[model samples]
Target: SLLIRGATVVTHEESYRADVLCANGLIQAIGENLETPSGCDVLDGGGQYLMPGGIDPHTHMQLPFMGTVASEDFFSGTAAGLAGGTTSIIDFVIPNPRQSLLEAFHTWRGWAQKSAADYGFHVAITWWSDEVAREMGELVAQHGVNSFKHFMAYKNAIMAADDTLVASFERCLELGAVPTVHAENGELVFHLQQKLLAQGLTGPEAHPLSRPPQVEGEAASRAIRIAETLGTPLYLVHISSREALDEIAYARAKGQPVYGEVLAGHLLLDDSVYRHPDWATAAGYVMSPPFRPVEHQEALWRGLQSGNLHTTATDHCCFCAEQKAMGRDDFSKIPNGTAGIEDRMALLWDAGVNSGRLSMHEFVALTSTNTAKIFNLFPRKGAIRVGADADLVLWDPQGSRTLSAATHHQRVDFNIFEGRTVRGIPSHTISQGKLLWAAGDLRAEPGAGRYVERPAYPSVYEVLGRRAERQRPVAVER
Candidate 1:
């Protein structure tokens, strides 16, 4: 049993000072003056903040790409997330072209079998066919994965064409799942990369040069148009540019159901990192939908405040310094990614809340509640109220910390947010009513985390009157 006393508890809609009690892996009660039970571990959190632990909806643990896999597998990655305040993560499962959706889900489960924090998967739809469409239904009905992901970039590698994306979107509508896309123009990126390589301009600078803001905006506009035509809701992953944000904002203004996500890195860093004199320093930031200009960073921040962006996540596909040397001479071959799973919550709080761009309520919405509702975990894992899982973060707004790679738990070799100082951090992290981490200490148990089976729900777009036409022909009509 546990009792946390005299802390400010924040929810998506409100924040109040209270004492919270936990038992049997759930929040047993919450009030201004709760009685502490005998033998319970009690903590005095006076002047601190208590909120539902953060939920990262984007991560790539042990994901293979460009002949190397991300350095942090499930165990280490989830530990890193917990240490920084995230309790649940939704990792993407990118399938091979011929594998069934179930096979891919189980395969990713094998990788996540030992995660120390609870987890779920968003199955990637990399290929499209009637057979693939049929398996998507089975995935939702049996496997409990209700979101289908697609990449509009990567060209011949994993990117889907318009026809494929359209087919997949329609299938998601039919199967009670939502369609999400990685919005980038594949053909444009591929050709631009080829041109850069042909001109002997193979550096991290050329990586961004190959895929400009226009490409992203075009791709985002196209994907949203397709979803609008199909009358399905859409989620844009890692949206980084003002151009792309413009497209999303336009559609949203028309009342279309378009949700957008921005990476913490995209909201903080700029393209100037590519111009650093040291090549490795430059190459380290080369993730797809690459970081944008500083101007875009401001747009992302404002977008979140204005409701143009719905959530924040870390596309935490981490490759070690050695692994990123694959494209030492050719920027295209550098396995694209950087590590932020461990620092995401702090960075956002320091930059968003502390920086005066977000309120405490808005912070809860972006970091936990909205993610829960969008991903189907709401009211169960995203709230600190009674009957909810006691996944909580004891946030010390007065506790300050400087982030660095040496002290972090992620298996990756470099920290994207290294050397950054933050005004606040999580003092204690609890998972499923268990104290998993204290300041500078870890207490994760092997196999303690469980796989979350999400329930099916209609996309916001479809639930608002965008269903397929059908007759009540099952009626006993003459």
Candidate 2:
């Protein structure tokens, strides 16, 4: 058992002084100045805010992509996330085309056996078939996977064509699972990349030039239209450009159940990194929907403030310098990735809350609660109430840290946020009633984390189904 005393508990709706008690991997009690039971561990949390640990819904730990694998595996990646106060991650099980979804899920389950924090999986629908459609039901009923990912990029490799996209979404509606998208026009990207290469613009700077904002906007709009026609809820990941954000905002205005997720790197960084003097330095920031112009950052902030954007993620895929050098001669061959799992919460707090743009309540929602609700992990994983999982963070709002690859726990050698000092970091992190990180000591253990099960037909489905029912067309007798 563990007891944290004298911290202000911050939730999505309120903040108040309270003492939290944890036992048997769940919150036993929450009250004012609670009495400690016998033989219980204690920690003083005075002058800090106790909030739900962050839930990064997008990350690729030890993923195999573009001829090289990610450097950070499950154990090391989860441990690094603990250092940054993120206690849960929902990674993807991306099967190759024509591969079995069940086999891929089991393979990822084996890889994640060594995770140091609770985790879940969102299987990607890379290819469509009758068998794939039927297996999705098994994943939800037997395996507890309630979400599916559809990549609209990587033209020849994993892109979901229009027919596949429509079929999968219709299947999602029938099965009560949410469909998520990567949302970039892969065909356009392939065409433009060839054009750029033919023009002899093969440096890292040309990477962003190949896939412009319109490419993302076009795909986002197409996906949104499909969702509206099918009446299924949609989630777009790593929304970096205003073009994509605008489509999301526009759909939301019309009462469509379309959700947008913005990345920490997109919110804080810009495309200028692509123009850095050093080739390796420039390659480090290469990611899909590549960072946009400075003006787009302001628009992204406004999207979050206006409630159009529902969640924040990292897309935390890491490839060390050596792996990134594969494309030394061709920017198109440069792997599309960067690392940020260990810095999202602090960066958002310093930039969002300290600047007075986001209130403490909104901060808690974006970092934890909303994601839980959207992904169907709500009160179990995102609340501080009794019976909820004991995943909490004691945050010292005044604490500051200078971020760099030299000091971060992520296995990658380059940090996208290097040299940027940020305030408001986690002082103590507790996961599943265990003190995993405290006073600069990280005690994350391999295989200690459990695989959480998310059931289908989340709350959003009811609303969407009801609205769809009400607007459903009827036929008159001829």
Candidate 3:
């Protein structure tokens, strides 16, 4: 039994000073000045804000890419997130070209044995065929994976063409699953990369130059149009440009089930990081749909505030400085990823809430509730209320902290937000009714986290029929 007293509990719609009670890993009650039974442990939540632990919908811990693997495996990665108020994450299960989906899922499951936070997977469809489509149904029915991940880039490895996107979108609609896209044009990026190299522009600067925002925007528009034709739900991951936002905004405006995700790194950093005089420093910033101009930042915040962008996630795939050095000579060889699994919450509060750009409720929506609702983990994982999982963060809005690689728990030596002091941090993080982080210690163990299964939802095509549908129609709450 646990009793959380006198905390400012926040949800997407409201905030109140209350005490939250938990038993058997579930929230048992929430009320003012609650009492606890005998043997109940009590924690002082004075001067704290209790929020649902953050849900990072996108992350790629220990993923293999660009001649090296991501730095943090499941254990280290989830622990870092747990320390920072994230209690649940959905990592992508990307398979090799010829790998079976079943085999890939189990392999990734093996890799996640030691996760300190509860986790789920968004199975990636690297290649699609009649067989792959059939397997998609089994993945949903048998394994409870309700979302499909598709890549529109990585031309050489897992890029899906327009035909693939159309086929997968239709299939997901039929199977009660959602399809998310990495919206970057593969052939365009490939062509630009070779062209840049031929011109002797093979540096970190050349990386973003080759794959500009236009490439991402073009693919985003293409994918949105495909989903529109299919009347399926489409989520664009890590949108970093105004061009892509324009496409997403237009689709949603017209009543399509279009969604967008913004990364903490992209929301804060700009493209100048790639132009650092130090090649190693610049190379570490190389990632797909590279960080954009500062103009996109304002547009993203606007979209988020206006309900255009529904979620904020860290496509937190990380590579060490040594691993990133693999592309020092040829920028194309650099693994495309960055780390923010640990800094997401504080960084958002510092920039969004404390800066007056986002209300506490809006911050909750972006970091936790919105992701859960989009991914179908809502009411169970995203809210602080009775009958929900007791994954909660005791946040100290008055606390101050400076972010740096030395103190962060990510298994890397570089922090994208290094030296950025963020004013708000979680004072205590509880996962599944257990104290996972308190004071200065992270106490979560590997395998303590469970693989959460998601159920399929009705497709937009079915929900938004010709009879008449609501404008800007989003998720159909089950």
lDDT of each: 0.88, 0.93, 0.89
For model 3, state the Cα shift of residue 251 in Å: 0.8
Of the pair 1 and 2, which is ahead by lDDT? 2
lDDT of 2 by residue, 185-298 (tens): 999999999999999999999999989998999999999999999989999999988899999999988988898898889998889999999999999999998998888898
Clashes per candidate, residues 3 or more apart or on different chains:
0, 0, 1
Error in Å for residue 445 of model 3: 0.6
- Model 1, span 1-478: residue lDDT tens: 9999999998888989899999988999999989999999997889889999999999999999888888999999999889999999999989877667778878899999889989988999888778788888888898878888999898778888989998998888777687888989999999999999999999999999999998999999998999988878888999999999999999999978898998889998988888889887888888988888899999989899999998878998989888999899899999998888888888988988997899988888999888888877888888988999999999999788888887788887677777889988999999988889898898886677888878777436345453434422366668
lDDT of 1 at 433: 86
Candidate 3 local lDDT, residue 318: 87
User: Candidate 1 at residue 403, lDDT?
Assistant: 84
Q: What TM-score against the true fold does each predicted structure earn?
A: 0.96, 0.99, 0.96
Clash number for candidate 1: 0
Q: What is the Å distance of residue 28 in model 3 from its true position? A: 0.6
What's the TM for model 2?
Answer: 0.99
Sort by lDDT, top down from the best? 2, 3, 1
Q: Name the lDDT value of residue 227 in candidate 3.
A: 85
lDDT of 1 at 465: 53
Off by over 4 Å in 2: none
Better of 1 and 3 by lDDT: 3
